[PDB]
Design a protein around this ligand. Structure first.
Ligand code: T2Y
Ligand code: T2Y
Lengths: 304, 304
């Protein structure tokens, strides 16, 4: 019993983190097979960042300008290319600790673990969600760029995020491992404002199910609702609309707890309208939206 | 910028987790050097758990009754002993992935990472605190016993916790790696009630400092207080008393932010008396007490 914001075990990803230096810029790279993936802004001065032309900056860079260190051993760079906003550095050594892996572009609402790294060295691991405005609310200091977000399916690491920048509001933007930013962000030190950070309704519902499973039931009410009625309330409260796809995804939690999805919706409706009245659910005074239905099933069933 | 509940990277501990089976009971063990440490209740039936005599139960057990599996390879058990509430299984192979390690008994308020494991396989990692009533609020299902709590100092894992049981209230109790329970708990399926789960005041203050550092300042007020005045309010609100030792520990955060500890105390006082008024601090609607001053310095400075 009990329900915790839980990251994936980080060992498989720890074994992939390296330091990438280009001139005076040091950040993290991800070493998979004989390729080191890192943010392309490794080639920039903080001056360059104001208005970088990456193709033009990259012309001035040779393989030997990319210093790649894995532990305290230097890797030989034998090729480099830009793919969108990441550099792929070909090295002469396959990472012997390469896990089975995929590159996946996640949808907003999807959760993943971040292994925060500095100089290629893991400092910590935490659980994040792709916000509906395609930001994440991370913990990233200067040097943390190239830290990666990931999910694990048994023995396969799906890399979904690489850290690139902090917006002036101190929320985070980055790319998939093909170098494509989540959302409209660019790797340039310019005014970039996030859109509305809406609540991930399907994640809140999952977490309400997690609460019932773990004995926190005080918020269960006598009401039901409809998707349309619920959605009017959701919209008013900057919650994402709930679709029948979301209702389908919650089916197993519905079945386990015997609480119809639309009944749990009506409970959430009353919580939005009435607030918590100083009460907590699973030790939180606000409605947690950084657990997916899959996350709740995983943690409640003990998947390894 | 940003501040996350952050666990230590788990790789060093993942490399130590094994499955221990005695008859029909399977749980996790920690393999360090040629010793596998696991909860002594591995020898119990759920019937035994009602009133176990462990010395008497252990007489019926030989080395070959302890089945130790590391990945999908069996370790040979060549000795076993009971130390308090843990078994030490001597194996003929030193764990080749043994990190530098210590066994440490932590104080209440102290935070650590848990690597939740089932059948010796890591499922997840989360950050905990030893509650002032010597419980922890974990996420543990049947099979999770022998999962360990730890801190990392650069390359040295300090193991502080091994999971043993869930109280009827669904909070958790366990031992240090010498097998001594935190608090008054016993490895017996009997009524065991926790004492008052008070708030770890020094941890709240650290986290208020973390909030100021990361730009959340709305709660800073125009007041100061004294340790005695603050403590009267703290006591009333089931907060632990603040000592001069706590004030000393917060000194560096005080210095970094230019906010005197007693001023931050007066801010916390007003938050207790006035509540959050629907506002959040670092994305929380309640005052977080599971970051130590050391945790706040570490995450705010990016230690690896
Ligand atoms: C996010 C990141 O690490 N990018 C590279 C970088 C940015 C700013 C900065 C440093 C590195 O070092 C000091 O300041
Ligand atoms: C906490 C733990 O894993 N202890 C051993 C154990 C207790 C209950 C239980 C099982 C193992 O398997 C099923 O139920």
């Amino acid at each position: 019993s009990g329900f915790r914001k839980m990251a994936f075990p980080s060992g498989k990803v720890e074994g992939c983190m390296v330091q990438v230096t280009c001139g005076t810029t040091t950040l993290n790279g991800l070493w998979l097979d004989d390729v080191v993936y890192c943010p392309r802004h490794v080639i920039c001065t903080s001056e360059d960042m104001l208005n970088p032309n990456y193709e033009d900056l990259l012309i001035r860079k040779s393989n030997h300008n990319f210093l790649v260190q894995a532990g305290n051993v230097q890797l030989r760079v034998i090729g480099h290319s830009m793919q969108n906003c990441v550099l792929k550095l070909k090295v002469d050594t396959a990472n012997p600790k390469t896990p089975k892996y995929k590159f996946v572009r996640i949808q907003p609402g999807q959760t993943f673990s971040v292994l925060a790294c500095y100089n290629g060295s893991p400092s910590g691991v935490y659980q994040c969600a792709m916000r509906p405005n395609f930001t994440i609310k991370g913990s990233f200091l200067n040097g943390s760029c190239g830290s990666v977000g990931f999910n694990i399916d048994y023995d396969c690491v799906s890399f979904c995020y690489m850290h690139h920048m902090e917006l002036p509001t101190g929320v985070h933007a980055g790319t998939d491992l093909e170098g494509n930013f989540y959302g409209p962000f660019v790797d340039r030190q310019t005014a970039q404002a996030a859109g509305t950070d809406t609540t991930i309704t399907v994640n809140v519902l999952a977490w309400l199910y997690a609460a019932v499973i773990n004995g926190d039931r005080w918020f269960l009410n006598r009401f039901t609702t409809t998707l349309n009625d619920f959605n009017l309330v959701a919209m008013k409260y900057n919650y994402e609309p709930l679709t029948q796809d979301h209702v389908d995804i919650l089916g197993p939690l519905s079945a386990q707890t015997g609480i119809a999805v639309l009944d749990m919706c009506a409970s959430l409706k009353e919580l939005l309208q009435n607030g918590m009245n100083g009460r907590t659910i699973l030790g939180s005074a606000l409605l947690e939206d950084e657990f997916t239905p899959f996350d709740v099933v995983r943690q409640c069933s003990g998947v390894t």
